[PDB]
Structure formats: structure tokens, C-alpha cells
Symmetry: C5
Subunit: 208 residues, 5 copies
């Protein structure tokens, strides 16, 4: 059929990175799930935390679909060639440091999977981080300019070990992670903006 | 009967990011409003503060207008495809750090709203920041190259809560925030440059 | 024509990489540093962090147009026009431009470019804690154009040395003097003109 | 006989930087080998180490091959004109800092070689760094978005000293370096991602 | 042919990614470090923060032009020209060019580039606090071009060492010797020429 070069060419032909792939007249269903990899530099005085994580992002874009009958059903494409959710962490106090090659996976049916590793600083509750019950830091992520009728965010509830990929060499340890969906409204505008809230319950590891 | 692809497309046909959309001979009306999200660093000796805020900027651009009678009346567009006010913080001692996706919301009537979240350090009065009455840090923001006749800056007076969006985990707290208007002239030229004096009356949270 | 046409023509004539040497002779570039602040200062290492507005002027005949029935001046991205390759010889960090990179172009070809710069220099910091104060020398000039291509001369004028100096700074400006110079180097036989700006300052609140 | 220009041009005309050089659906065999050069900023408390190494990377793309009969059999080419494996250090806690020109080396038989010098922080076991047995820091490097069916990583078990290129001025010393191979699956996909695991064994040089 | 014409020409015939090899002979590139300032230093970790002007010269005939009735020198952005792919072999931080990135091109095809660079190296600092001082040796050369493709010779132009060094620094230059050398590895049989810049300095006596 066609080769990976043909698939990419077609993409750049039918893709519109600056236009949201609004299916029918309904918002794009962007799924977000954070995989905590490390917890660095914590300050209980300034309520700040340096965190490394994998932002597993997904959504569909039918304008990139193709017939993978006798050709590959998946390819890696630079995000600059694709439309990407304008996600932002509300309580983030430093721009996200993308530590991995910014490539997205695209399936022939239009399913897009972007999972960059991210290091970033947040302003959250760090209190009790050294107590047995630990602290609970809450990360809010969601579109920055698209409201509920354009983009919906939902956490892909996939029963897994909160610290499955979490470093064993960190001074801290995850106790639990729960991801809830929310929808806030602002005075700037009459519409609401969906967002996912990830609650990181961690603490400093004791001693033998 | 046009979709978002048409809107963005048409926008790029009439948009002149490097040209100021001055209607006839009157200046461009820019509404500026800062929404303090956090106060990270504060130095009583050097009188410097590291702040985080949502700079709500507004202005109209008729050349971007379009009939939305049968299409979305709004779309998010990269600020690189639109002209944007050359606002600057006169007492900033560090370059602005935009923590959010650089997208603007453009309304079918040409209205433009850009609200980036910024972290920036300033030089201002920090004295009394540890007192009951707290400290008052004023931030002067305005066009850097367009004088009063070309660009005008007015605060988006919207009597709301000063700390409505302020972080609760900060070591400081907002006492009050007033945003007035100013018109200062300089040496370079006899033209007067308009600015907005945001007065952030804040103090260190005392409860220990 | 409108401002769109003025900026348009500037894109046709302007050669951002071709020095506007008018009829075989150097280009007259004036430079005036408007010290705004003095941040971190180390006497042990002799290094200082300084914020200032580098007021740069010069003429580019190629840009001149007819302001008979059109705006006399327009702001244009410095990337759309030739700009001096000024450099600070005793600079120890890249020049951090805190303001929008726009220059003021007058219909007669006169160009004004005044960015706010945050930089770290290597200079005599000793005596900063004394009455006479310390004097820091800033040598600025073209990095690749010699005396026959660029002539850098301080915009001498009975201006106020502390006119725009932050009142909230830990230091106070005692005196600012600007001496012009012309040095030759061990690479080329030609002479490179420079401008030395002496910044006399000291700590405030010292025991009298 | 063709010269370097002709050769480069040939590469640009056939090379697909955003397309993996797959040969009949078999995966691209990618070889990795880190030549540690220096170890800096070690922290046994937080288990973080800064490492400087030469990531020797090798793979093939026979579509770029040419007849070096009477013409150069090798040329340097900007990696932006070539397809480069999207390798990533899974345990890195800082984006890679490339300290050298980003040029590759293409050989007349389609073999491509890229060896950038990198400085990067990692989260690994550091306990024992000040002991005779030293510490063992395992670094995992492998394709970030291409699974084993698309890319395969294999450590060149070539004979060479461990601290051969290692700085003698480093506060540490390499006791031994062993490169293994892995293939992990993730909650995203059923396919596996091959990665080379380098185990560095070093200890604080004790001049006693 | 005025400057606009010159630049146009250069920018139109310059192949930034194609090494300008004259016939079969390698490209003769000259390297000269002019230490402008020695910042932070650490004898414990053997690391120094140096500032130096990297004088780099070479030729590219393809850029030549008759300067009889026109200028014989123009400033051109290095991004428009092919530039030697030098790298400090023992650098532990990427080079911070603090000056405009422009080269000087003479009508004969001669190219001169001297950026001011601040960079951190890993080298011998032991004795920096003594009368003898320390000798930090910096090796610079091509990264991908071997001896047959590129050659680096330190401009033997007898000049002063601390000539442009900063007087306000905390250290002082005792001596500097640019020695040409060669380097080979177990990857490739070919050798890569480089320049060893021996920096002999010590802390200035506090008094
Ligand atoms: C997600 N939070 C927002 N506002 N808020 O006040 O929080 N969104 C509205 C916009 C932000 N930037 C543009 Cl343009 S419209
Ligand atoms: C804010 N201070 C100014 N002048 N001043 O003399 O203080 N602004 C005018 C300009 C700044 N940059 C250009 Cl170009 S015109
Ligand atoms: C400031 N020191 C110079 N030479 N020197 O020998 O010290 N400048 C001349 C040049 C700098 N870059 C080019 Cl190209 S020509
Ligand atoms: C300067 N040291 C080199 N190798 N070495 O093993 O030390 N150079 C060869 C190459 C550098 N980058 C590519 Cl691609 S080939
Ligand atoms: C390293 N962890 C991964 N998945 N996971 O679910 O943990 N990697 C697979 C991918 C990474 N980026 C894209 Cl796109 S697919």
C-alpha cells in the first residue's frame, strides 16, 4: 500500500495544527493522566515542589485518519505537525521543562497519543510532608483558552500503581494519587473551563 | 456556513501582527488588568518581589472581524498570527516568563482577549510587608513604543475580589489591589506614554 | 498611504544585514545608558547586575518616506531593519532584553531603539561601601564595524543621571559620565570606536 | 567524481528527518554507547548526579549511500537534515545539554554516526559513592516513541577501557561500566520499548 | 557593486553546511584564545569559569569578489557562512557567545570570527592559591572533521597574554602557551587536530 513517508506527507496535507478538530459541533475529548516519576526539591515553608511526571495525553483527530490495510497503522509525528490541546497547569510556577523528544503517536483511525516527560514547579500544599500521613499537593491541568463546549478533559481512570514508574531513589514516596475531574468558571468569561485535578499524597521516607 | 478552518484562514489573510490596527486617527483601546495568583519571593532589604499574575489584556481589531451568523463566533489564535500590544512593566527587573500557551481568544466582532499567566520580578516598595498594614508594591505597565495618540491603556475596572484567584498556599496575602491610570512623558520624545499603576497592597501571612 | 503601507515599504527597501553607510562614510550611532537599577553587587568578585535603558540612535536614509499625508513615525520589529552590533566589552552575561524589540522609525530615516537591558559586568566594585563610592566602567561599541563604518559617540546632554533610577534600590547614583574612545586591536589595523560610561554609585543608609 | 556539496545535496533529496528509515518493516537497528567523560555535582542525600558523556549513536540508512570510488567516503551533515533516533534517558531529571556542534557523519554505505557530548542530571543510586566498592548509577536510554518492532537498541560490546576518556581531574573515578539491554512494556501500549541500561560504577577518589 | 551587492553575493554562493575544501587539501583554520577574565574557580572540583575572545580565521574562496571599485570587507552573520565546528574537548558547559554572531569577510575570501565566550571547563586548578599558580589546559578543535578535512594551527603571532585580561578579576595570568596537537580514538582511525591553550594563573594576593 503506502509507506511511512506517504502517511507523513498526507498528514502535513490534511492536518491543521492551529485548528481544533471539532467533530460535528461537539468539543474534543482530551484525556489526561499523570504518571509520577519523581519528586524533587520540596519546601514546606514556601509550599513549592519540583515534580517530574509523564503527561499521558490522548484525543481523536479524524482529519489524520487513513486506510492501514497494507500500510502501517501508526507513526510518530512531531507535535508541530499536529493540533495539540493547549493544556496548562494552573498552579504551575515555572514553564514546563519537556525532557523527552516531542513526538506524538498517531493511529490510522485518528487516535493521538502524546506522553512527554515533564519537570515543573507547583504552588501546592506541602505541609506535613515529613509527617506519617504525608502532604497532599493538588495539580490542576486543563485547556487554557478552550471552554467546555470546545474541549473536555477527563482522567483515564486506569487502576494502576500510583508510583508504578516512580523512582525508588527519591527521598519521597507516593502514598496515594487520585485524579478528579472539575469545571471552573471565571469572571473573564460567561463559559466554564474543564480541568483535571490530580492529588499527590507523598511524604519523606523514614529510616531503618 | 464556515468552520474554524475558514476563520483562522481568513484571519491570516487580513492580520498584520506588525501593524497597529489604529482605526482612522484615534488610538487603540487596550484594557489591562492583572490578576495576582501568587507572591513567591519578597525581599525587604532589596525591595524586590517575584510575582505570578494573569495579565488580562483586551483590545479590538476590526480587520479580524467575520460574519459568525452561521459559524463559531470565537476561536483561539496564536498571538503570532495577530498584532499584540507592546506592553511592558516599567519597573520589571527580569524578563516576563509566560507560563501558559500563547493563544488569544478572538471574537467575531474583532474583539481580542489575551490572558497569559506571567511570573516576573519587580523593583518596588516592600517596606512594611511584615506589618499589619502590609506593604504596597506598585507596578507600571504600558506600551513601550506607542504614545498616547496611537495606544491608550485603561484598567479593566471590574469591582471583584482582589484575591479571588490568589493562591492560598502563598506565604503572603492580598490586602487590596487598586489599578489606576497614568500619563507620563519622557526625554526621548515630547509624546506622552500612557500606563496603568497597579497598587498591590499585601503583607506576610501571620499565623504561627 | 496608511501605516500598513509604510511598514510594507520598509520591508522592500530595508536590508537588515546591510549597514546603511550613506555615501561612503561611517554611521553615526549615539548611545546613552539610562541606568534604572543596580541589583546583585559583589565586591569580592567585582561583578555587578545592572538594569538600564540603552538609548540608541542613528539614521538610515533607505528607510525615509513621505510623511506629507501619512504618519510621521512608526514602530517596527528590529528584525525588519539594520541595527548596530553594539556590544559591552566588559559584559559577563548575554544582554537580557526585558522590553519588546521594536524601534522607532521617523519618515526622515532617523531610527530610535531603546531597549531595557539587564546585564552583568566585570568592573571596579571596590568602595561601594564608602562616601566616594565605587565607579563601574561600561565599555560599549560596535563589535565588527571599525571607525570608518561605525562611529559611536555618547549623546551628550545635561540630563539627570538618576532621572529614572529606582527610588527603591539599595544603591544611589552619585555621578554618571560618558567618555568616548577609539582602540585598535591585534587582529586588524583599523580602529574600533567605543563609549565608556562610568557609573559612580554607593550603598545607601551609611553611617555618617 | 562528486564533491562534498554533491554528496550533501543527494542526502537532502532522499533523507527524511521526520521519517524512520525502515527496511521492509524490519526495525532500524540502533547502536548506543556512552563514553563517560566526567562526573559532577554528586548528592548521596538526594540521589542525584550530573554526568558528562559522549553518547555514541549508530544506525543505517542505505538510501543515502553513494559510490565513494573516486569521491569522499564520509561527510559531516547537520542532524536537522537527517533522521535521528528519538532516544531518551528514562531516569534523567533534566533535559540534555548538548555541548558540541550538532553535526553527524554519514559514510558512503549509508551508515550514519552521531556522537554528541552531553551533560545531564540523573536520579540513580548514589549510596556507597564514598566507599571502596563505590556506587552504581544505572542510566536507561532508548527510543521514546518507537517500539521494538520499529527500533532496536543494542550496546556495542566493543573492547574499550571504562575511564579511557574519563577526566583525570574529576573528583571521582570509574571502577567499571557495564551496558545491558532491556525491553519494557507500558500501560499505554501492548508493544515493548527496547532500551540499553548502562551501569556506571564510580567512587570518590581517595588520595589515602 | 556596493555592500548590498556584496552581501547578496555571499549569501547567494555560501554553502553553510559544505566545508569549503580547496581541491583536496584540508581547510586551514587558525584558533587564538584571548583570555578576558577568569571568574568562579574551584580547586576541590577542578573547574573554572573563563571568559575569552575566540579568534578564529580561515578562507572560503567561493566568497571572493573584486574589490577594485567596491569595499574589500563586510560583516556577515555566521549563520550565512560555513563555520568550523570547533568544540572545547574538556568543556563542561555549552559556550555562551556574549557578542553579536557576525564574521568579517574580506574580498579575498578570508574569514575572521572572534566571539566573546564564557564557558566552564574541567581542568587542573591545583595550586591556584600559590606562587606557582595552576595550569588549566583547554583543548579546542573540530568535532567531526579529521586532519585531512580540517587543520588547526594556533596563530604563532607573538603577542601579550594578559593584554586584554580583566584587571578587576580575582586572578591574574602568569603565562599562556597555545600548542598545536592531535587526537585519535578507538572509534575512528583518523586523528583530529586541536589547540591546547595552557592557562597559568593564580589568585591575586588580597592586600
Ligand atoms: C482557563 N482559564 C481562563 N481564564 N481565567 O481567568 O482563568 N481562561 C480564559 C482565557 C484565557 N486566555 C484567553 Cl485568551 S481566554
Ligand atoms: C519608556 N521610556 C521611553 N523613552 N524615554 O526616553 O524614557 N519610551 C519611548 C521609547 C522606547 N523605545 C523606543 Cl524605540 S521609543
Ligand atoms: C574587540 N576585539 C577585536 N579584535 N581583537 O583582536 O581583539 N575586535 C574585532 C573583531 C571582532 N570580531 C570580528 Cl569578526 S572583527
Ligand atoms: C572529536 N572526537 C570524536 N570522536 N571520538 O570518539 O572522540 N570525533 C568523531 C565524531 C564526532 N561526532 C561524530 Cl558524528 S563523529
Ligand atoms: C515510557 N513510557 C511510555 N508509555 N507509558 O504508558 O508509560 N512510553 C510510550 C510512549 C511515549 N510517548 C508516546 Cl507518544 S508513546
Amino acid at each position: 500500500a503506502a509507506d511511512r513517508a506517504d502517511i507523513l506527507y498526507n498528514i502535513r496535507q490534511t492536518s491543521r495544527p492551529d485548528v481544533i478538530p471539532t467533530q460535528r459541533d461537539r468539543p474534543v475529548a482530551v484525556s489526561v493522566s499523570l504518571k509520577f516519576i519523581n519528586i524533587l526539591e520540596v519546601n514546606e515553608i514556601t509550599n513549592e515542589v519540583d515534580v517530574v511526571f509523564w503527561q499521558q495525553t490522548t484525543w481523536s483527530d479524524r482529519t489524520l485518519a487513513w486506510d492501514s490495510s497494507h500500510s502501517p497503522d501508526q507513526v510518530s509525528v512531531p507535535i508541530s505537525s499536529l493540533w495539540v490541546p493547549d493544556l496548562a497547569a494552573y498552579n504551575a510556577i515555572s514553564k514546563p521543562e519537556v525532557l523527552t523528544p516531542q513526538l506524538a503517536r498517531v493511529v490510522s483511525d485518528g487516535e493521538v497519543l502524546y506522553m512527554p516527560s515533564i519537570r515543573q514547579r507547583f504552588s501546592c500544599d506541602v505541609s506535613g510532608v515529613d509527617t506519617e500521613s504525608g502532604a497532599t499537593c493538588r495539580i490542576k491541568i486543563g485547556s487554557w483558552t478552550h471552554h467546555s463546549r470546545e474541549i473536555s478533559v477527563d482522567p483515564t481512570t486506569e487502576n494502576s500503581d500510583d508510583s508504578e514508574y516512580f523512582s525508588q531513589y527519591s527521598r519521597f514516596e507516593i502514598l496515594d494519587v487520585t485524579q478528579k475531574k472539575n469545571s471552573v468558571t471565571y469572571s473573564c468569561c460567561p463559559e466554564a473551563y474543564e480541568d483535571v485535578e490530580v492529588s499527590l499524597n507523598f511524604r519523606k521516607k523514614g529510616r531503618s
